[PDB]
Specification:
five-stranded mixed sheet, Ubiquitin-like (UB roll), mainly beta
Length: 91
């Protein structure tokens, strides 16, 4: 794939374990595609199976954080430039 930055791009802070990387995603980018972007830009995403991990929308409270569905898009989850999302393992 290719590193996104086209026009208005959703710059989210991707947390993988302890690695927080500000990543620029396209608004219409699907969650499985955003994962495709991290795995390629940050190697730590490849710490396990792709469906075993996932995108976790980070809020101010841990219980407000939700798991982004692969079949949905980033914009769909009200994601913005400056938000934090932790690409981490499910369960």
């Amino acid at each position: 794939g290719i590193d996104p930055f086209t026009m208005v791009a959703l710059s989210l802070k991707i947390s993988i374990g302890n690695v927080v990387k500000t990543m620029q995603f396209e608004p219409s980018t699907m969650v499985y595609d955003a994962c495709r972007m991290i795995r390629e830009r940050i190697p730590e995403a490849l710490a396990g199976p792709p469906n075993d991990f996932g995108l976790f929308l980070s809020d101010d409270d841990p219980k407000k954080g939700i798991w982004l569905e692969a079949g949905k898009a980033l914009d769909y989850y009200m994601l913005r430039n400056g938000d934090t999302m932790e690409y981490r393992k499910k369960q």
